[PDB]
Amino acid sequence: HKTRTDNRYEPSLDNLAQQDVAAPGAPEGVTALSDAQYNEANKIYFERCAGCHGVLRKGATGKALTPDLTRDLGFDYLQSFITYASPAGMPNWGTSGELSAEQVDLMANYLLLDPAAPPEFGMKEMRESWKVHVAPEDRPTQQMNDWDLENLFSVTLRDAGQIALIDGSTYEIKTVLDTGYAVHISRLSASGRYLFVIGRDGKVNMIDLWMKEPTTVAEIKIGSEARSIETSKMEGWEDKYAIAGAYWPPQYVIMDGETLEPKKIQSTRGMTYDEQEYHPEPRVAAILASHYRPEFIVNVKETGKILLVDYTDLNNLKTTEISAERFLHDGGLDGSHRYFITAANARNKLVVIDTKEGKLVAIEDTGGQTPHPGRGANFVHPTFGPVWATSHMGDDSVALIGTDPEGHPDNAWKILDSFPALGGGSLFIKTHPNSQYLYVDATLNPEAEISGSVAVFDIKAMTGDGSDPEFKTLPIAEWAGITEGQPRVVQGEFNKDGTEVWFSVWNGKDQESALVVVDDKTLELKHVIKDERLVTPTGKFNVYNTMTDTY
Amino acid sequence: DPAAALEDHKTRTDNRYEPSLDNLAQQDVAAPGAPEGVTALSDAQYNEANKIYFERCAGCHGVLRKGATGKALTPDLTRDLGFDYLQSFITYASPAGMPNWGTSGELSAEQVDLMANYLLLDPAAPPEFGMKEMRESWKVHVAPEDRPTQQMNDWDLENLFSVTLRDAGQIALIDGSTYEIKTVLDTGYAVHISRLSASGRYLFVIGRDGKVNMIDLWMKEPTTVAEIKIGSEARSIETSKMEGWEDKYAIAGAYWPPQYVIMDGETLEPKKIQSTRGMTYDEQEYHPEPRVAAILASHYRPEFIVNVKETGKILLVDYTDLNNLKTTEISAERFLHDGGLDGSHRYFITAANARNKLVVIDTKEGKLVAIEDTGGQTPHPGRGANFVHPTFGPVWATSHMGDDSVALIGTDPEGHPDNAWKILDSFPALGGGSLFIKTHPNSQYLYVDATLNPEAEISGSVAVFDIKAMTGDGSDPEFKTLPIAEWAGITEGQPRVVQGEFNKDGTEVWFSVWNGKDQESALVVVDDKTLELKHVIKDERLVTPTGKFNVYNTMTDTY
């Protein structure tokens, strides 16, 4: 229950926590909580505990806390245990994990009562929230603004419920668009015309980059808690569909790529792959799109299932449910775009799926604690050949896995090397075909100096001889020149040409933040982006690199 | 207005066939707490109400009370209605269950109050049943290696009949030519159906309580060689029938938990469990209790065909790879129940009973091909009846529970294009309450029962149509009425005749004369060529005979 560098990345269901709940009756031997006491405890539970234990308390990374188990433990045990607090959430907006004596009582009593399941969110609810602001027939037939769309960057202004569209060459903020609250990621249609953003509360906004003044042409709510979205990327299916994944309800939704009309909702509730036991809360994590078949690649966390969903027929729906490893989170395709490599983070494993054949290929331990690749980093190692890399939240290690079964059979799907970067708390590793450098952040590191810097390895100098490759440390936060707080540097993202890499210097909402652009060839500071509108910048997504999956 | 119960809860000929979860009802449950404004029930009182609910109400309203054919009765809804309304409504009783064993639907004043109070309380979900639970129940009595390598008894296995002796939880293996009860086997609780492996060697039976038994017909004395529990309430089972996959797998479907399980065809080892919880096909709303109904096996692909009732989805599950599981979830129609393959074994035709529709799936292409209203009320085909109509061509027939109609649908898209998947004719048989229609390739007759008809004369008889005399003139073909119950010579009670089943040669058809467990029942064998009584099977052991399955016709899907 203490704060580890690799346990702060748990889901904070703060949007779901806003829903009022009715206090249940208490069975013999259990004391009931008033509506207010219960609601106060429920809000705390959803915001700080549900991530590890589940809203239904059936367990996730943390064990189940169902009434039968908790009642056996007793109020005294629960009270004493909860007194120590709980793991802190993500920095800047997350919880501290500290509880008062009054709250420790509410929490202990709450865990002894029978929880209700939060409301479902189906077609009727989605269609009611579905709004087409600009019908397809009323949209332009060609780009009507003069922006360089493919070099645009879509930046999340987290706490402001907005995104900034920034010119990748001039660094001018072309526009700031409202979305509501905390967009998690931006994804582009295969043609690069449509920008899709998903907010943590399940709201999806679709933006037409071809309009003279790009704006939301359609919006829809697909759940109460969501983190993922993706577009159809199979040749011939450009702009056909979009898909969104939710934590609650546990489901994914395929929507029309032009109107956001909800077409197919699929529940992810089901059996765990290994112990084959029913799990009522299998959250949808990363969602990618196949380049080999007209399918979406969906990670189902708690059950350890990777779904290949064929979108050529939504009525006679074909899917391949792949038994993988529990706690699937993020991942990416290799350089050839044929293999999906994903982190089963809590189990320190990388799962590899062949998207052409639709089958599991390998599962390997990285030797590190809690791999968190984001989409990862693909590059040609001088000795090993094609590899994909990931850093870790739990330690300072960077692991490389071979990704070329045809040309380098002996290295394929094997962890070829592991070496240290700046320190623990890493979230994103990055490179680009035109770059000779491998960038690794350390966002969640407890040391300000480290969390504000980035490690950079020279791929060309890598020998794979077993020694630890040296790295240059870029003082990103220092380059941004921010006085107050301990801003955290996060997520490298390259421009279309792969000549410049951007990083977010993430500070609190009422504090100063910035984006730092680094000249990839020289590893020197290129530009510092600051604007009063740039509030809590986090995710950044270059249109071209996102639409083509170039990483 | 509570007086609305007079119609909503009235017993009809077509509303007595909803599930009775009497096995799940046996589990003792703790009383939940009662929130403010609600009076609590003691553990004893709550358990009593729970048992009644699972036995008489859960079929229509759901174990979780989220609604099935009947509306949801969750605490949020019932509390708004209030105790007074519920008490008054429930006082009128509820629809009766199936004959002989079903509920009367009558409640005492004490019980009515227990039910009203029960509905105001928050129900807990019954226990799940996963791999750990299944493996704990898994027992292999005779390892494959120790079984015979050839038939060791002298029985004509293909002409054998596996008959459900319902209430006793037994099955009688009866010789198809001598009519001798070769053996009566015990499985514990009520067996719903018998299915045969593709080779015809293994007999699989599914108990309503979720118990699966596998019987080796090659043993000198056939007995259960392996058993396993796959849930708390189950009604379906099937074997792999794709060429090259003989004896490879068995699959069982459950009402609770909502799931299906693929097992090893030789040992019953549980291999893959799949939850059926999901979204309804049309309104796309989450349903927490989608029951698995009929399960058939594809002859065109190595797949099982699974009907998921409340969500209206037909699943085509590919068993060639259980790790990288390929399935096709076909949006069909809600309330899918029973069905069968056409004569060519390519198309699955199934009844979405509560909606009076027949759904047709192309098992080769793995897609929905048609949905047609039968024009009748509550179609209940069983596996149906396929035959080449003299003027219409290949057709599949179904009778109805809600009326006396028999509907024919064309099943030949290539050879009789205009007639394909269209209701070609509809005509009356004996009366409403029909459950099974039957024919065989070697017979020119179509048999139709009327099991649930309120009139004894009708419920104890069968209508027989002469397929050869059928024209396409739109008029109603005549039928001969066979007094099956009368032929059986049974005095006490009103036994009901149910389900025709042919012998291997298709020269004789059997019917069950179904009476109560403490009453006399019988099996009646009719000579198909003459439509005359051939033989009556009576035995003190023949208690509550219902489903009958001929080994050959079942293993080959000949109907």
Ligand code: DHE
């Ligand atoms: C499932 C998931 C994905 C994969 C998206 C996809 O494939 O489309 C993802 C990706 C991401 C990516 C993707 C990067 C990429 O390059 O693909 C980014 C930038 C990101 C910024 C953040 N994430 Fe993320 N994130 C979660 C979930 C996820 N994050 C959480 O549940 C968690 C731990 C807590 C929560 O309740 O949200 C969490 C906190 C954060 C943050 O605090 C970050 C740093 C800032 C923010 O804006 O909230 N997450």
Ligand code: DHE
């Ligand atoms: C899901 C299902 C099937 C499909 C089987 C398959 O494809 O493997 C089926 C088939 C059947 C078939 C299949 C016949 C065939 O030729 O395929 C028969 C004989 C049959 C005899 C009965 N059924 Fe059945 N039956 C149910 C469910 C089902 N019945 C119920 O839920 C119900 C309504 C009440 C209950 O709680 O069980 C019920 C009551 C009955 C009876 O009362 C019958 C008449 C006597 C008995 O033994 O219980 N059901």
Ligand code: HEM
């Ligand atoms: C949030 C305030 C919160 C509560 C409440 C909570 C409770 C809780 C209890 C009572 C236990 C004891 C379980 C037992 O049977 O002994 C327990 C145990 C663990 N928890 Fe927890 N927990 C809260 C929050 C969190 C968070 C944010 C995490 C995940 C980072 C988490 C994790 C765990 C883990 C791990 C355990 C130890 C046992 C195990 O599952 O290995 N909890 N929690």
Ligand code: HEM
């Ligand atoms: C079992 C004894 C049983 C109970 C209890 C029960 C309750 C119940 C209530 C309180 C209503 C009224 C709800 C309202 O007005 O909102 C209600 C309504 C219907 N029921 Fe029922 N019911 C019990 C049993 C059964 C059975 C066995 C069936 C199915 C054959 C059934 C069906 C219905 C139907 C139909 C209605 C009317 C509303 C609708 O869903 O159309 N009930 N029941």
